[PDB]
Design a protein around this ligand. Structure first.
Ligand SMILES: Nc1ncnc2c1ncn2[C@@H]1O[C@H](COP(=O)(O)OP(=O)(O)OP(=O)(O)O)[C@@H](O)[C@H]1O
Lengths: 466, 160, 508, 466, 73
């Protein structure tokens, strides 16, 4: 801890609320952030000063509850807020939302009592630059491009193998990518969180990311706390050059969280009482996440849907926090393919026409033409007897069967899960093998040959298997 | 009556006053002041006065100005503040200033009142009742005490 | 409040009589977040911006008698109060005149140029207001959109004001910089003030500052997520002044700014923080009192101006200041009080449909629902004269398309119109990063005017022999420079274009 | 203007705002109106006491801004507010909103430092009476009757020739009417105001009315100021017997103006914070404007549309401030006729049936029947082939062509503009010539003969020209 | 505030009629023109005041009420 040697403070003047109506050592005031750690009955109390207000009388607040104590008090002032053991040692080891050894002592590796306050870089510092990204997902990293060291809006419903593909991310972000792969969550179902410890064994790769969890009953400060200490962590990983890429749970928890926040203030909050600066906190947020100099500061962007809000100042912000748009197909899950999700609505923003230029303006943009091809070939040509439809529309239905089957491909996840090995994929074998093949080449490649089969050597050499 | 404004007062009373030792000296001056507002014409005339200067004027003036200059220029301070409106707040808070400073006391239970200054519990207390002598408790003597244990008793008559 | 002292009431025991602390520095009384009750600085000057300890000149506007409340200069929350006052009566001095152009600014100024050593004339206040009603130039001073449909649809000149809304994700942020490419050569120095920007947008943007060019034409504003109402809210109020370098040289001054509302609740949410009345939408008519103040400014100003505006230095230059609103198209929430208010204020206006950006039609916007005060007023014989019949005819191909589906069999009226207007309608779309040439406008002038495109009118040949048109035209039409130089509707050159248009049939 | 010899006052107690937290010579208080003229830094300051409140401490306010000065002060008390050089000399000469010599010194003729406070007359004073009005507009003063010395609601969009017809008002209110023709405005476009100086040359007749302008950036008091001094002016014109008729700019500026007013009060204002008594200010308003004993106190009633409010407590008040309803036709401007505006919705209230009795109950009310006649003759008979329609419906279409063409008539404006002479018209030649002619007489009168042609000697003797 | 409220400063010696609502009463005054603020008006302010009265009126006795069909033309 900091100081708070000396017990400081004094009484809690009017005993109401976690924010301090409190006599501190009245001359004593820290930075409002700069913590004040008392004894809370038995417990050691603490409040970062909610208010900076004189007479040692300022709001100083906490995620807990005050009943039972005397208005009288004295409260040691933890000269630092924000400084809590932090670094990359935590990886895999269970941190409380306190970072506390969440598990049987989860002992997320005790590290620098490290200020949460890690934040935006200089124009050049984390990359004045652009850094693209792909891990070579079988049908997917091929499908969409990405920018390194960042976060992109994730829209999809269910059956993701998000834990599977996370194992592909273990098989990538841990494996097929080196950069330190961290993640965190909050507000889950209890034994279902424990079942994400089960899954934590499913990937088993849990060691890449400390276990730190909210369990939504956590109070609003408790609920909203963990992030900036997360920056005391990427203050290892990205800062550790092993690019910080950490998976991001919950926006609705965060959106509504900042709502409950500015509400508690009683302040003129954001509209509908939300956190007024929660968006500015997004400026601090993406301000944190950049493919960096240090190491790419990257984050998995998926939102607790702020009610999946309409026009969603969140999605409004999460659009442009989405380099690639996203959809997941229960229909491709109804197609059930090793590609089981919605390629529709899922691609990088600038990939096809420029920025790959033709590379995706041909392979991928022309590929999108093929999306029209099985789109109205499968769809239109499905409307009535496709006999009218040129067999190209039925070779857009071998784009479907054949090619879309090729999309179905083993997964580095499915390796880490079903054993279906999968890969960091080569979109050359897409941009050519799947683009030429899926389009004109080896159209005799069976669906099955292509189905559940990786790049056009797995789909088309599985067409040697046919 | 906020007495909190007068808290800053009695603060400055032990503080500047006791610093000046006016805690006693303007216990005297102060005494004469509560005498001034105590004047009911001086209450009847208390506030019509827009100029608080007029107030401290006719106040020290009227009453005879036994206030200190700490209390005359302070008379500018509170009079100007108009917080001078409430005299006794920091008067019992100054009584609490010197007295709280000096605090030792008692309270008679089941007795006519005691208030024997006891720096410690039972110190002058058990020394007083032991010292009784008095031992009569006259006010609260019997019906109060015997109705105390018997109060608990009727509390058992809760059984009816 | 007062009783708080009890120590200076301990003083005041004497020191209600005892006295005399008046100084530019008495203590910051109450420190929370750059709002400090504060002492000394007795009479202090206008909002007197008081050079703060390790911090900017701190401003307190209307004198708070007891302890003047003060404004966060940079960091709001640092410490406890009692600073005395690190104090300056001066407010509003910022490098002025034409000096520093082209080298990028902070919200502070040129300093955030990587150079940062860009010297404007020298410290000036940041305010500005309207050019002389009387002393005003009307500058038709035409302008080239770079997406022709606007330029011909709306010419304009120095002094102008108009409204704009850029659509979500397209096309607001990107907007017109092709015009800026077109305006890389604009020559009336132009800058844009963007509120609260995100950096790398500015970085690769700077890649387009090289690319499109030319950042040196003018330096531009700097505001990010951390922009205080100082930075954020005042930035639009801030940028008012030195363009008089040009403008009150009598020279042409022009600049851009857009989408400031972080001003609105920066300053307004400030008003809450200020405990000051939140107006409608928690922000007062200081919208229209700011537009009153700031937005009443832009004009080409008379010779009578720079006889004064330049003080007879330019001895009657016409102080030319044009500027335009863009309130980026969002939410469909429109009148929006101030926006309605400012709608009332808007001389010209752009209703801009995403839908065609939603349709991805390079031409997104609402067609003449965007309504500019200026328009073909600046347009030339070719432009005004030759280019005339647009928008209504547009409404035709629209309206001509209209009935077709439910009640059908639109004759070659609508076919030969709606489609002709659908064909030409197709010829409209101008992609992002597309500037437009005046000679290139002449393409529509003759072609459409000649109906000449009807030959190639197949969007295949329309575009194609539109390209052969472009090419062997440029071949056949070297003299077009004159034409491009010319304001057109030149009957001689007109016939010349009929001929080179016959070329344009196969060749050009 | 007044005393304020003596500098009076004292400090500005708490220096906030134009209203005075201020020590005056504390015993000194004037009438709240009764002005207090200080030195404002360099400037001479002034505030009419916003509040009457003792100790020389009362709100006293101004349209300006206070930053920079000391709370200390002394402020001379201009014993009079309201008294400012005023009279009819101003006519044509440019007054600031201060009346100040707005132009190169616009030198609106310095006149009685004259109290703004001129107001309502006795029941009889501005005559207990009714005074009708028309200037003989070619097709128009014929079309609608009017009441002298007043104001009537003006609804019409664009292309009015309002400056033209104003020249007809020069040709009338200055010419075809003698009564002193004054006008004023506020809140315009700068060089477009200067372009109304251009127009001021177009009419050239600007000399009838001092130039006094707001330029809407003028603060709320500044914005709302000029009127009552305007009554120190009609305190010439109407009071000068040369009937005050002054053109009235801006209601929205005034409506919203009083809004900003009572807002600034922080008072329980009108509903939606508007000026509570702004309507009572209308009682004072029409209370000012009457065909008077003195001279008809008349005003051109046209409103800055208080957002063109719906049911518009303004139009609610402006109805009944409209003796005649109003509309302007882009369609008759599409008809483009010398009558280019909307006769529809434009007529005096009581004209036809009574109050002209038949005179307009026949000529004008029966004329309105003719409005049905080309209404469904032109309209209905237009629906399909009018062969069904009796040629009366086509002589209601010669009411249109022929008669409505006769409506198109040269204008005393168009004289003062295009030279098309126009007149103070004689509705006899309407009530007969156009009523009988337009109806049954000389129905052979060509449209053109009638078109752009004045009363039935110009239309019908232009039918001698045919 | 009866009538004009803006003229002068507070502290004008408070002058007091102990009577709310003493206003000309009785049937004397009919026909002669009156302001609402006062019985005066043009031309004759005067009318026959059967004397100072107070206005406010409660309902008459329901029990003692003359039920009256007195016709309407
Ligand atoms: N009509 C259009 N058709 C196709 N693309 C368009 C159109 N308008 C804009 N765009 C594309 O979108 C980009 C403009 O988007 P921009 O960066 O302006 O987001 P935005 O319009 O600012 O959205 P928001 O208003 O939400 O900020 C340009 O690159 C352009 O290529």
């Amino acid at each position: 801890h900091h100081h708070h040697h000396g017990m400081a403070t004094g009484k809690i003047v009017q005993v109401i609320g976690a924010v301090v109506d409190v006599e501190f050592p009245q001359d004593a005031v820290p930075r409002v952030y700069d913590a004040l750690e008392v004894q809370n009955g038995n417990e050691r109390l603490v409040l970062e000063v909610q208010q900076q207000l004189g007479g040692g009388i300022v709001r100083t607040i906490a995620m807990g509850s005050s009943d039972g104590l005397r208005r009288g008090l004295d409260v040691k002032d933890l000269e630092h807020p924000i400084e809590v053991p932090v670094g990359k040692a935590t990886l895999g080891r269970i941190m409380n939302v306190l970072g506390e050894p969440v598990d049987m002592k989860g002992e997320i590796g005790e590290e620098e009592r490290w200020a949460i306050h890690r934040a935006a870089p200089s124009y050049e510092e984390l990359s004045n630059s652009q850094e693209l990204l792909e891990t070579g997902i079988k049908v997917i990293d091929l499908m969409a491009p990405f920018a390194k060291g960042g976060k992109v809006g994730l829209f999809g419903g269910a059956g993701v193998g998000k834990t599977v593909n996370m194992m592909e991310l273990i098989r990538n972000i841990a494996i097929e990518h080196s950069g330190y792969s961290v993640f965190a969550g909050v507000g889950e179902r209890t034994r279902e969180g424990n079942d994400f410890y089960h899954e934590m064994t499913d990937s088993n790769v849990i060691d890449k990311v400390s276990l730190v969890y909210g369990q939504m009953n956590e109070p609003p400060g408790n609920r909203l706390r963990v992030a900036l200490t997360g920056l005391t962590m990427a203050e290892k990983f990205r800062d550790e050059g092993r690019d910080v890429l950490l998976f991001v749970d919950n926006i609705y928890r965060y959106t509504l969280a900042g709502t409950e926040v500015s509400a508690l203030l009683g302040r003129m909050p954001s509209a509908v009482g939300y956190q007024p600066t929660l968006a500015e906190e997004m400026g601090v947020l993406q301000e944190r996440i950049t493919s960096t100099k240090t190491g790419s500061i990257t984050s998995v962007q998926a939102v607790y849907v702020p009610a999946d809000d309409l026009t969603d100042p969140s999605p409004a912000t999460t659009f442009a926090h989405l380099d690639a748009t996203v959809v997941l197909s229960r229909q491709i899950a109804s197609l059930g393919i090793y590609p089981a999700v919605d390629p529709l609505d899922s691609t990088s923003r600038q990939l096809d026409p420029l920025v790959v230029g033709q590379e995706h303006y041909d392979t991928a943009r022309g590929v999108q033409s093929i999306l029209q091809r099985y789109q109205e070939l499968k769809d239109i040509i499905a409307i009535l007897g496709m006999d009218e439809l040129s067999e190209e529309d039925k070779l857009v239905v071998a784009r479907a069967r054949k090619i879309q089957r090729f999309l179905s491909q083993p997964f580095f996840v499915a390796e880490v899960f079903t054993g279906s090995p999968g890969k960091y994929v080569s979109l050359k074998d897409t941009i050519r093998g799947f683009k030429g093949i899926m389009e004109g080449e080896y159209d005799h490649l069976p669906e099955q040959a292509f189905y559940m089969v990786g790049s056009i050597e797995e789909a088309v050499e599985k067409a040697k298997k046919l | 009556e906020f007495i909190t404004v007068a808290r800053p007062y009695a603060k400055a009373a032990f503080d500047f006053a006791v610093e000046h030792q006016s805690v006693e000296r303007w216990q005297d001056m102060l005494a004469f002041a509560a005498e001034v507002t105590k004047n009911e014409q001086m209450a009847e005339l208390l506030s019509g006065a827009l100029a608080p200067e007029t107030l401290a004027e006719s106040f020290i003036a009227v009453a005879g100005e036994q206030l200190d200059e700490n209390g005359q220029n302070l008379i500018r301070v509170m009079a100007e503040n108009g917080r001078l409106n409430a005299l006794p707040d920091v008067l019992e808070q100054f009584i609490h200033l010197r007295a709280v400073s000096e605090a030792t006391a008692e309270v008679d239970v089941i007795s006519a009142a005691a208030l024997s200054e006891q720096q410690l519990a039972k110190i002058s207390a058990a020394m007083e009742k032991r010292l009784s002598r008095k031992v009569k408790l006259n006010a609260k003597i019997d019906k109060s005490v015997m109705a105390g244990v018997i109060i608990r008793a009727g509390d058992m008559v809760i059984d009816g | 409040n007062s009783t708080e002292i009890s120590e200076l009431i301990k003083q005041r025991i004497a020191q209600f009589n005892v006295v005399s602390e008046a100084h530019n520095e008495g203590t910051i009384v109450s420190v929370s977040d750059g709002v400090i009750r504060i002492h000394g600085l007795a009479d202090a000057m206008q909002g007197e911006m008081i050079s703060l300890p390790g911090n900017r000149y701190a401003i307190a506007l209307n004198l708070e008698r007891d302890s003047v409340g003060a404004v966060v200069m940079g960091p709001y929350a640092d410490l406890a109060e009692g600073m005395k006052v690190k104090a300056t009566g001066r407010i509003l001095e910022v490098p002025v005149g034409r000096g520093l152009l082209g080298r990028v600014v902070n919200t502070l100024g040129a300093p955030i140029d990587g150079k940062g050593p860009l010297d404007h004339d020298g410290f000036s206040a940041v305010e500005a207001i309207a050019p002389g009603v009387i002393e005003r130039q009307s500058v038709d001073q035409p302008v080239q959109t770079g997406y022709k449909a606007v330029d011909s649809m709306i010419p304009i000149g120095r002094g102008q004001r108009e409204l704009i809304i850029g659509d979500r994700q397209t096309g607001k942020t990107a907007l017109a910089i092709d015009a800026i490419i077109n305006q890389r050569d604009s020559g009336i120095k132009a800058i844009y003030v963007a509120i609260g920007q995100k950096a790398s947008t500015i970085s690769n943007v700077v890649r387009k500052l090289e690319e499109h060019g030319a950042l040196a034409n003018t330096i531009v504003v700097v505001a990010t997520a951390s922009e205080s109402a100082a930075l954020q809210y005042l930035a639009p109020y801030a940028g008012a002044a030195m363009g008089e370098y040009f403008r009150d040289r009598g020279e042409d001054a022009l600049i851009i700014y857009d989408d400031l509302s972080k001003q609105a609740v920066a300053y307004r949410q400030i008003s809450l923080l200020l405990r000051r009345p939140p107006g409608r939408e928690a922000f007062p008519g200081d919208v229209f009192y700011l537009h009153s103040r700031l937005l009443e400014r832009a004009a080409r100003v008379n010779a009578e101006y720079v006889e004064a505006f330049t003080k007879g230095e330019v001895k009657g230059k016409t102080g030319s200041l044009t500027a335009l609103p863009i309130i980026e198209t969002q939410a469909g929430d429109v009148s929006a009080f101030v926006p309605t208010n400012v709608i009332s204020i808007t001389d010209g206006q752009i209703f801009l449909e995403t839908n065609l950006f939603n349709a991805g039609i390079r031409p997104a916007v609402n067609p003449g629902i965007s309504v500019s005060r200026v328009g073909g007023a600046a347009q030339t014989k070719i432009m005004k004269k030759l280019s005339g019949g647009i928008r209504t005819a547009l409404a035709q191909y629209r309206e001509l398309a209209a009935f077709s589906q439910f009640a059908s069999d639109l004759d070659d009226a609508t076919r030969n119109q709606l489609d002709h207007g659908q064909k030409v309608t197709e010829l409209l779309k101008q992609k992002q990063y597309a500037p437009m040439s005046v000679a290139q406008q002449s393409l529509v002038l003759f072609a459409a005017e000649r109906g000449y495109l009807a030959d190639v009118e197949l969007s295949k040949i329309g575009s194609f022999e539109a390209a052969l048109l472009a090419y062997v035209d440029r071949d056949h039409a070297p003299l077009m420079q004159e034409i491009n130089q010319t304001g057109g509707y030149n009957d001689e050159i007109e016939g010349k274009l009929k001929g080179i248009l016959d070329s344009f049939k196969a060749t050009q």
